[PDB]
């Protein structure tokens, strides 16, 4: 809510991805904190298992509700940190409601 | 430019991809957002930081705001706590 | 300090080009036998695999930690 991105680059979302989709490289941000310089989910590689949703300790990477993201070009499907963070900002209100409804179950 | 600063120079090829297109960059750059966060004053020597909301936060850690010299910063939220 | 990964012999093919990819910056490799590391229980069996498959081999002898004598009483010796 403050505005600091949740991911702290533990990189086990990369470890458990079955398809090798997520690529993460990180370095200490000047703040001294730990953040990901590059976070790239290759959606064409991703098979939408939802384990990344499962694995994240801070729950920074989530399976968002939108299913309509069909794209004219293959490159658009590859997603870097800025698209995903932008995707996160757009759907945060519903993502928060969805996680709110299902967290007791998990 | 972006959070990290990824940028393409004039001589830099690999910048054509944006020609007649747009790049994905972020307003609300996080680097400055927690810096914009007030320092959570506390009474106790040590304090917790669920991240806010328990299960919907970060693995709870206890920060030692023991020296006013330094406001403890939970390695997960980047929230500074003022003893 | 665990030694369970220093037990079985492994033979690993020589490392090859890993150029950066222009579109996403991901590492890219043109060598198929790169990620392949076969595990063999004994030095003799691994050498055999190289000979029949025709790959060149350069075996490195196992080096195991030498026995080291330790005793809690010994360091309490003011003398030394």
């Amino acid at each position: 809510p403050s505005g600091e991105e949740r991911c702290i680059a533990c990189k086990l979302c990369e470890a458990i991805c079955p398809a090798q989709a997520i690529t993460i490289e990180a370095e200490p941000r000047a703040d001294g904190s730990r953040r990901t310089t590059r976070y790239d989910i290759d959606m064409t590689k991703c098979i939408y298992c939802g384990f990344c949703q499962e694995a994240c300790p801070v729950d920074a990477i989530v399976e968002g509700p939108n299913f309509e993201f069909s794209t004219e070009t293959h490159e658009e499907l590859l997603y870097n940190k800025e698209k995903l963070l932008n995707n996160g900002d757009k759907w945060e209100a519903e993502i928060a409601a969805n996680i709110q409804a299902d967290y007791l179950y998990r | 430019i972006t959070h990290t600063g990824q940028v393409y120079d004039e001589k830099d090829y690999r910048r054509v991809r944006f020609v007649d297109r747009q790049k994905e960059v972020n307003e609300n750059f996080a680097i400055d957002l927690i810096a914009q966060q007030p320092v959570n004053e506390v009474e106790h020597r040590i304090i917790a930081c669920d991240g806010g909301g328990g299960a919907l936060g970060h693995p709870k850690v206890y920060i030692n705001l023991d020296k006013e010299t330094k406001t403890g910063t939970c390695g997960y939220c980047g929230l500074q706590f003022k003893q | 300090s665990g030694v369970n990964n220093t037990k079985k012999w492994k033979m690993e093919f020589d490392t090859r080009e890993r150029w950066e990819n222009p579109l996403m910056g991901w590492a890219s490799t043109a060598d198929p036998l790169s990620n392949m590391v076969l595990t063999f229980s004994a030095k003799e069996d691994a050498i055999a695999f190289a000979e029949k498959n025709g790959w060149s081999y350069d075996v490195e002898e196992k080096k195991v930690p030498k026995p080291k004598s330790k005793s809690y009483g010994a360091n309490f010796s003011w003398n030394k």
Partner: peptide, 24 residues
């Protein structure tokens, strides 16, 4: 309730020694 372009965000990794612009 009531076109993106993908790119590497990480910077260069090996810096080239730049030649001295002073002629010798």
């Amino acid at each position: 309730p009531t076109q993106y372009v993908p790119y590497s965000t990480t910077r260069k990794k090996i810096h080239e020694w730049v030649p001295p612009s002073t002629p010798y």
